[PDB]
Amino acid sequence: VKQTIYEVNKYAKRSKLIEILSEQADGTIVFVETKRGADFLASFLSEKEFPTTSIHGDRLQSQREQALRDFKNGSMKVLIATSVASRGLDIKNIKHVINYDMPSKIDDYVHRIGRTGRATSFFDPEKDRAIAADLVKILEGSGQTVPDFLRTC
Amino acid sequence: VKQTIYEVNKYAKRSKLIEILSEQADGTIVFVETKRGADFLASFLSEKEFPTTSIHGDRLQSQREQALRDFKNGSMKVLIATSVASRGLDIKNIKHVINYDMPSKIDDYVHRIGRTGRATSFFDPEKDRAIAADLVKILEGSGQTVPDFLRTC
Amino acid sequence: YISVREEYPDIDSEVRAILLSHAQNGITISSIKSEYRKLTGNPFPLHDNVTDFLLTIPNVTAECSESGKRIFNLKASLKNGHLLDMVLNQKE
Amino acid sequence: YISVREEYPDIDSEVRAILLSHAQNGITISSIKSEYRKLTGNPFPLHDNVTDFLLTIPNVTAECSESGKRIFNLKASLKNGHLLDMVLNQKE
């Protein structure tokens, strides 16, 4: 899996995501930290003409399944899922995984990117410092370039 | 049927009606001219603690029947009906008929009298002048006192 | 609005009754004003900041419609719910 | 509001996305301001006349609850209807 890590401040993430989706959006899963963040982003992206659905912990099982079916059938080009509700998701062969919010555990990073291939992550230097060393090890293990900002943590 | 006619200006009618209902409200049918007038009055009276429903020409048949049922079963103390809709209503032994808006035809006045008994009517001298002479005849024929204002038209 | 409510003691019920009668499609401020004058014989007692006033009346709603019009309507209360239900389900 | 919409080009979408996420119970102005700052990093750009501003945004609704609180919410649009439906029917 081709992995790219960008250094992105918290409130610059939305613009960076839109820049990426504008290049190519189809079959993208975006992982975020909170349920409210997931619905906010799905609403915002949908208004920007990227049909986007969401999955999070407040959703009943039938609703999660429907959202997933919409993503699978093509009616929703983008799926936003929480860090937590991501662990149980059964979906693979994703075109693009985007970690809008970095996971707190490296096992989640490995699992998330195992769903695609192409994975892009936004590293917030004021939030994600603790996972940097583990991320470096995964990038190295995957034969991927390691950006300097990760090593300087 | 005890018939009482009050001379009441258009915008004095609502207060006069409330005075009357405050003495006794149960089993009252009130006839008004317009559909929105009927709904306005039913809303207003309900908020003043007289549970009031309405029947008019915009109501589907099932809705008319339900309103009539609520009046018959006691859950609605007052029923507001338009003058036009009144001519098809199948209901008698009403405690009190109130002509909030006087009918334009004396035959309608007579028909409503038959549905109750007390009947109270509001005569608006800027609207109901034409029916005065016929009303005098009906009052006299029914052994009722004729108020002098009906003779000066 | 204290002056308005002092002088027009039933204004909440009058407005709600107007909104209830128009609940199928809602109603604009200009139409509320004209309906108020027709029903009561008095001009609506506020000229401006009418949206804020209407939204001090329990159960009153406002919507910015996709058409661009600002439309006012009503939520059901215990006392008027039977009526609102009929209006919303009557002939279109 | 010309000044606001100039400086905050996505304010309509931002506000709608906040309201959508809170659609089960609606949300007060104070909470909209709080959520706005949390999600964008900027304070909400209006201090007064907020009700009037919010009601210039297509699909935004306001209600005077029986509790006395002024509560804002959203009508479904073609682009967000799928999300609004899920929020309204998700866990209580």
Author numbering:
A (entry chain D), B (entry chain B): 465 to 580, 587 to 623
C (entry chain A), D (entry chain C): 146 to 237
Quote what the paper states about this structure.
The conserved DEAD-box RNA helicase Vasa plays diverse functions in germ cell formation and germline maintenance in animals. The core of DEAD-box RNA helicases is formed by two highly conserved RecA-like domains, often flanked by helicase-specific N-terminal and C-terminal extensions. Here, we show that LOTUS (Limkain, Oskar, and Tudor containing proteins 5 and 7) domains present in the germline proteins Oskar, TDRD5 (Tudor domain-containing 5), and TDRD7 bind and stimulate the germline-specific DEAD-box RNA helicase Vasa. Assembly of the Drosophila pole plasm is induced by the protein Oskar.
To obtain structural information regarding the LOTUS–Vasa complex and the role of LOTUS in stimulating Vasa's ATPase activity, we carried out cocrystallization experiments using the LOTUS domain of Oskar (amino acids 139–240) and the Vasa-CTD lacking the C-terminal extension (amino acids 463–623). The crystals that we obtained diffracted to 1.4 Å resolution, and the structure was solved by molecular replacement and subsequently refined against the data set to R/Rfree values of 16.9%/19.9% (see Supplemental Table S1 for data collection and model refinement statistics). The crystal structure consists of one LOTUS dimer and two molecules of Vasa-CTD, each one bound to a LOTUS monomer on the side opposite to the dimerization interface. Hence, Vasa binding does not affect dimerization of the LOTUS domain, which is consistent with the experimentally determined 1:1 stoichiometry of the LOTUS–Vasa complex. The interface area of one LOTUS monomer–Vasa-CTD subcomplex measures 1080 Å2 (PISA analysis). In the complex, the LOTUS domain is contacted mainly via the α2 helix of the Vasa-CTD. Conversely, the Vasa-CTD is contacted by two helices of the LOTUS domain: the α2 helix, which is part of the trihelical bundle of the winged HTH (wHTH) core, and the α5 helix, which is positioned at the LOTUS domain C terminus. Interestingly, although one of our previously obtained crystal structures of the LOTUS domain alone also contained the C-terminal extension (α5 helix in the cocrystal), the extension did not adopt a particular secondary structure but most likely was disordered. This suggests that the LOTUS domain C-terminal extension forms an α helix upon interaction with Vasa. In Vasa, we identified two point mutations in the α2 helix of the CTD (F504E and F508E), each of which prevents the Vasa–eLOTUS interaction in GST pull-down assays. In the eLOTUS-bound CTD, the conformation of these motifs resembles that observed in DEAD-box helicases in their open state, suggesting that the conformation of the open state CTD does not change upon eLOTUS domain binding.
